Design a protein around this ligand. Structure first.
Ligand SMILES: CC(=O)N[C@H]1[C@H]([C@H](O)[C@H](O)CO)O[C@@](O)(C(=O)O)C[C@@H]1O
Ligand SMILES: OC[C@H]1O[C@@H](O)[C@H](O)[C@@H](O)[C@H]1O
Length: 504
């Protein structure tokens, strides 16, 4: 083996991880450091003592400390599992730097969490972070060597909440975030309820929703709004808009996998609408026949094989035209997709396709430029060219398109993300979310593109660690809501900040 293992007895081993998830004011029992024993305390043990450090700046930002003890080693803060992780909580005075528990209280468990209640105050700047470190773990007065696998650094954000966590509602997994703010200020968050594992269609998947009427301060209990009925009969990959008339529209796919779809046995595209801020939804309406396949009235598209609109949000233009970008498979001989805008000029009654917007594209998103042109951002699938994100422009409200290399300048490891058109210090800019990578789904970042100089900012990492799809919306009061896939086993996390918190 990699290490020498002695033969004079069993050797307890201690591992510790500092936490780097975001936090927000007033949150309860937030993990700062996690400690794992490799085996239970031995039967003759009487006490475990844990010594720790915590800088004054962090002490001033917390109201209470705790040692939590669990039989489970969890990725996220223990309250995020809503009781599915059982734990005991042992208070520590916030000024103390050591704590001890009897072996009987530990009751054979191996996992310890130095946790804190967060106070009401914060500056939210890049440097507004919380940290602690475990300095000693001693059993019956004998210290153990500690294996430190990560430092603690929890950034304070104006809002931070995991809205969908593995296990919630009985679903094993969650993926594929979509966020919408309505004109009345309601927030709708939807996701794939990946009930049996984290894999895509053709797995059996439901679509689930939560809604907030207070700007993300609190969220309704999750509701399954489309229920998968078995393998090859699931639904997922939601994108959302609100039409000019005010109805909410969700578009999604269901059925076999994208590469298994054929003209005669398609993976289908459906729409559903809500006229009451997301409280109720119409039965899914199949609109596949407007796009491709054996029921399509355009014979030039009746042999195309598959289509899916990119999850997250579409775009409703000032004219009222409703748009989403579809990525369409035109040939069964190649694993290649071409982008077309799927649009409706009659509030969703009928749907049409633009001319082709991008060859060898993938999930693509739209945003409205200051002058009325439409910018499209296209995922780079298959490490094409210089592994950069691709862009295109339309000046006819999405009907025709031309590649826009001047907008390129950020890496795309091959992942969905989102755009917001913003004004900052009097300058029109585009905010774009993507994982930084490089070449992996790590370090969820945002960048600003300055329209006038044609240059991208350095990235700002919002959520370090494993990070994948992201969606973003602008709230009424000027904050940005950023809804991201955090972790290798994904939770969908809603983070609220203003631009100056990240870029100033
Ligand atoms: C309908 C569908 O399959 N959507 C899936 C897409 C497409 O397969 C790729 O974008 C095609 O290249 O990719 C994911 O798997 C991914 O990369 O995390 C997630 C998503 O659920
Ligand atoms: O070092 C030994 C001593 O240390 C204590 O902390 C421990 O609980 C007892 O076993 C005692 O005998």
């Amino acid at each position: 083996g990699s290490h020498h293992h002695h033969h004079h007895g069993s050797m307890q081993e201690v591992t510790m991880w500092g936490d780097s998830h975001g936090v927000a004011p007033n949150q309860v029992r937030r993990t700062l450091v996690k400690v794992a024993l490799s085996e239970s305390l031995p039967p003759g043990a009487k006490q475990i003592r844990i010594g720790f450090s915590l800088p004054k700046e962090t002490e001033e930002k917390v109201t209470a400390l705790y040692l939590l003890v669990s039989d489970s080693l969890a990725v996220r803060d223990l309250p995020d599992y809503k009781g599915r992780v059982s734990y005991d909580s042992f208070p520590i005075s916030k000024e103390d730097r050591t704590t001890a528990l009897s072996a009987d209280s530990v009751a054979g468990r191996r996992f310890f969490y130095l946790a804190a209640d967060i106070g009401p105050v914060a500056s939210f700047s890049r440097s507004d972070t919380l940290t602690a470190r475990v300095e000693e773990v001693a059993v019956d007065g004998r210290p153990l060597p500690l294996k430190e696998l990560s430092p603690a650094s929890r950034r304070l954000y104006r809002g931070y909440e995991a809205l969908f966590v593995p296990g919630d509602g009985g679903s094993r997994n969650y993926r594929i975030p979509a966020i919408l703010k309505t004109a009345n200020g309601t927030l709708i968050a939807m996701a794939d309820r990946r009930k049996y594992n984290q894999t895509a269609l053709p797995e059996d998947i439901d679509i689930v929703m939560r809604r907030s009427t207070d700007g993300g301060k609190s969220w309704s209990d999750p509701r399954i709004i489309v229920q998968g009925e078995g393998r090859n009969h699931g639904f997922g990959d939601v994108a959302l808009v609100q039409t000019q008339a005010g109805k909410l529209l969700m578009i999604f796919v269901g059925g076999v996998g994208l590469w298994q779809s054929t003209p005669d046995r398609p993976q289908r595209t459906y729409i559903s609408e809500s006229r009451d801020e997301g409280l109720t939804w119409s039965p899914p309406r199949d609109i596949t026949h407007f796009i491709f396949g054996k029921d399509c009235a355009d014979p030039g598209r009746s042999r195309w094989l598959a289509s899916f609109c990119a999850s997250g949000q579409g775009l409703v233009l000032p004219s009222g035209r409703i748009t989403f970008v579809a990525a369409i498979r035109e040939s069964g001989q190649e694993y290649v997709l071409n982008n077309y805008v799927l649009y409706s000029d009659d509030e969703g009654d009928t749907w049409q396709l633009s001319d082709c917007a991008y060859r060898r594209g993938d999930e693509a998103k739209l945003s409205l430029m200051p002058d009325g042109r439409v910018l499209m951002s296209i995922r780079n699938q298959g490490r094409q060219e210089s592994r950069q994100r691709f862009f295109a422009l339309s000046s006819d409200d999405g009907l025709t398109w031309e590649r826009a290399k001047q907008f390129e300048g950020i890496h795309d490891p091959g992942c969905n993300g989102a755009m917001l058109q913003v004004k900052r210090n009097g300058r029109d800019q585009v905010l774009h979310s993507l994982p930084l990578g490089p070449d992996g789904r790590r370090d969820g970042a945002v960048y600003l593109f300055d329209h006038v100089s044609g240059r991208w900012s350095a990235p700002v990492v919002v959520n370090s660690g494993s990070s994948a799809y992201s969606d973003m919306t602008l709230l009424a009061d000027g904050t940005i809501g950023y809804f991201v896939e955090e972790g290798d086993e994904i939770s969908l996390v809603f983070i609220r900040f203003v631009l100056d918190d990240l870029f100033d």
